[PDB]
Nucleic acid binder design. Structure first.
Length: 52
RNA sequence: GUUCGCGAAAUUUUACUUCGUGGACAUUUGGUCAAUUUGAAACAAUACAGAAUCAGCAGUUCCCCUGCAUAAGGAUGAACCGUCAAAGAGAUUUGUUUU
């Protein structure tokens, strides 16, 4: 019961929005070849997951 | 003066009676049942020391095991890639192998 109420509580963590930070943090990477398909998949996934 | 013991006499050895002899030879206290009875104050009633035991759970304090929550923190896997929708008006082009 506490486990399910936790998820019904998680949805309120979903509809919470931004509250923009102060300083954005940036990194720059550079590569010779992106052709590897799984790398191309992971860079998309992990970008969507972390809200990067 | 009281008793116990030994020796002598009068009678039937122990016994009574008397002489010579060795001890022992104080009284009290520390001894109240408590409780209850309308009277010039006594111990007379009225009781009468009879004036509960086995077992179960839980709760505080620490420890371990296993869950779920929460705060932080990490490790890894997931094949395919992003600068609109509708309607209206104007401008340009368009004989035989795969229908």
């Amino acid at each position: 019961r506490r486990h399910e109420d936790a998820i019904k509580r998680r949805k309120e963590a979903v509809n919470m929005n931004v509250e923009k930070p102060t300083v954005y943090h940036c990194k720059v990477f550079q590569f010779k070849n992106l052709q590897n398909p799984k790398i191309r998949f992971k860079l998309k996934m992990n970008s969507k997951e972390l809200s990067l």
